C-alpha cells in the first residue's frame, strides 16, 4: 500500500503509545529529533509482508520480494516501522488475499507500482492464449496458516518517507504551551516578545 500526508502535524508520541513495533529500523535521522525537523510532504507506504521477508525489506538488502514487488532506494534516508498482526487476521485454509507476483520481465525501480494481466513466456513462442506447459502466468499465493511459527506470519509494515521542498513545512509543530501561573515575577516569550514582569 502507498499513501501521502497533507498540511497538518504528525506527532510520533501517540504512534509510540500504540504497540511495541517489531522493526524500529529508523536508520536515517535520529528518533529523538523527529519532532524538531519537519517537511512539506510525507509518504506513508503502510502494507503487510511475510515474517521471513522482514529481514530483506531494508534498502541495504535485496531479494525476489524486493526486486520484483517493492524496492526501497539505498541512496535515500527513510524511517520504517513494522508490527506483528498475525493474530489480527488468520485463516485456517489459508489467506487468499495475500497473493504476490512471481515474476516480471524487467527488474523494478524503487517507488513504483505496476499491476497488469500478461503471461510470462518460457520459450520462443507467443503466450497470447492460455497455456500451462512452458508458458506460465506468474502466480504465487502464500496461504497463511495459523499453525506456523514466526517465519510465515503477516508482519504489517509502515514505510514513512520525507523530502524537502521550497514550501513551508507541515508536521513538527514547535508549539510550546506552559501552565501560565497567575501572580509571580516570571519571564515570558509571548509570540516572540522577550519580556519580564508580573
Amino acid at each position, epitope marked *: 500500500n502507498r499513501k501521502r500526508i497533507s498540511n497538518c502535524v504528525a506527532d510520533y508520541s501517540v504512534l509510540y503509545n500504540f504497540a511495541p513495533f517489531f522493526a524500529f529500523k529508523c536508520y536515517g535521522v535520529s528518533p529523538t529529533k523527529l519532532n524538531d525537523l519537519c517537511f512539506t510532504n510525507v509518504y506513508a507506504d503502510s502494507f503487510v509482508i511475510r515474517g*521471513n*521477508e522482514v*529481514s*530483506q525489506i531494508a534498502p541495504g538488502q*535485496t*531479494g*525476489n*520480494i524486493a*526486486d*520484483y514487488n517493492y524496492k526501497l532506494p539505498d541512496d535515500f534516508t527513510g524511517c520504517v516501522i513494522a508490527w506483528n498482526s498475525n493474530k489480527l487476521d488468520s485463516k485456517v485454509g489459508g489467506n487468499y488475499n495475500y497473493r504476490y507476483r*512471481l*515474476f516480471r*520481465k*524487467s*527488474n523494478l525501480k524503487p517507488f513504483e507500482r505496476d499491476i497488469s494481466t500478461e503471461i510470462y*513466456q*518460457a*520459450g*520462443n513462442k507467443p503466450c497470447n492464449g492460455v497455456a500451462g*506447459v*512452458n508458458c*506460465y502466468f506468474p502466480l*504465487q*499465493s*502464500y*496461504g497463511f*496458516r495459523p*499453525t*506456523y*511459527g514466526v*517465519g*510465515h506470519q503477516p508482519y504489517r509494515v509502515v514505510v514513512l518517507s520525507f523530502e524537502l521542498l521550497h514550501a513551508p513545512a507541515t508536521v513538527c509543530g514547535p508549539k510550546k504551551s506552559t501552565n501560565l501561573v497567575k501572580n509571580k515575577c516570571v519571564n515570558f516569550n509571548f509570540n516572540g516578545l522577550t519580556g519580564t514582569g508580573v
Partner: antibody, heavy 115, light 107 residues
Framework: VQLVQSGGGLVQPGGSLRLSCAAS????????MNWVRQAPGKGLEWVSL???????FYADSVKGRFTISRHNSNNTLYLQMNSLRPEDTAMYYC????????????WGQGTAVTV | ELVLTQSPGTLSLSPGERATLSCRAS???????LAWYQQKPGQAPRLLVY???SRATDIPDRISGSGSGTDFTLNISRLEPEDFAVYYC?????????FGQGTRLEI
C-alpha cells in the same frame, strides 16, 4: 527443453575455469536460475541463485569466488570459478529452478578438482 | 536453516506392494513451496510434485503424497522397476534454502 554444459575440465586449485550453460527451447535467460555442486559421496546442496535481474545469492563457503553472467543473443550463461580450493571437488549442475515447480534438472558436466 | 529427517537407512523394495516414504521438516513447515524429486546419480533426475497438491508431469500420479506441520509422507500403491532411485523433499523461501540426504531404495 534440454540443456548442455560446455567447457569443463580439470584444473589446479588457484585458477579460473569457464563453463557455459546453454539450453534449447526454453528462454532460460529470463528465469530464476541456480547453480549446484554435488560432491561424490555427498548429497545435493544449494550453492547459488541468480535472477533475471541483478541479484546475486551465494553460499558461505564459495563466497565471492563464483561469477555468473547471462548472454542476450542466446540462452547462454557464462560462469567463472576463481581461486579454486581442494574442497570444491564436485560435479556441476546448472538449472532454472523457479518457485512454481523448480523442474527439468540437468545431467551436468562431470569434473574433478585436484592439484 | 530447515532441518530434515528422512528414514530409514535402507529400503525393503518388492514390486507389487504399498510403500510409505516420509520426510520430517523443522518447525511446522508448510508444503505449497515443497518439491519432491527423484534422483539417480550419474544423469539427469526426475521431478515428482509441485505445491504438494498436484503432482508433476511425466508420472501417472498414483503416489499420494501430502502432510502438515512437521509430518510429510508419500504412499505409493503400485511399485514399478523404474523407481530404483532416491527421492528428496525440499522447501524454498527465496532467501533461505534447505536440502536433505534421502533414503536409498534397494532390497
Amino acid at each position: 527443453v534440454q540443456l548442455v554444459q560446455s567447457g569443463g575440465g580439470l584444473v589446479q586449485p588457484g585458477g579460473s575455469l569457464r563453463l557455459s550453460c546453454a539450453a534449447s527451447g526454453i528462454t532460460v535467460s529470463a528465469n530464476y536460475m541456480n547453480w549446484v555442486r554435488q560432491a561424490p559421496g555427498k548429497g545435493l546442496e544449494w550453492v547459488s541463485l541468480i535472477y533475471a535481474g541483478g541479484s546475486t545469492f551465494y553460499a558461505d563457503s564459495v563466497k565471492g569466488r563464483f561469477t555468473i553472467s547471462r548472454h542476450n543473443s542466446n540462452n547462454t550463461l557464462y560462469l567463472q570459478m576463481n581461486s579454486l580450493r581442494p574442497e570444491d571437488t564436485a560435479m556441476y549442475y546448472c538449472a532454472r529452478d523457479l518457485l512454481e515447480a523448480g523442474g527439468m534438472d540437468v545431467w551436468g558436466q562431470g569434473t574433478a578438482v585436484t592439484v | 536453516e530447515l532441518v530434515l529427517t528422512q528414514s530409514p537407512g535402507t529400503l525393503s523394495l518388492s514390486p507389487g506392494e504399498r510403500a510409505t516414504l516420509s520426510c520430517r521438516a523443522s518447525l511446522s513447515v508448510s508444503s505449497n513451496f515443497l518439491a519432491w524429486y527423484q534422483q539417480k546419480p550419474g544423469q539427469a533426475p526426475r521431478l515428482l510434485v509441485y505445491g504438494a497438491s498436484s503432482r508433476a508431469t511425466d508420472i501417472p500420479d498414483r503416489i499420494s503424497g501430502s502432510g502438515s506441520g512437521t509430518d510429510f509422507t508419500l504412499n505409493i500403491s503400485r511399485l514399478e522397476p523404474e523407481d530404483f532411485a532416491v527421492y528428496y523433499c525440499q522447501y524454498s523461501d527465496g532467501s533461505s534454502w534447505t536440502f536433505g540426504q534421502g533414503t536409498r531404495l534397494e532390497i
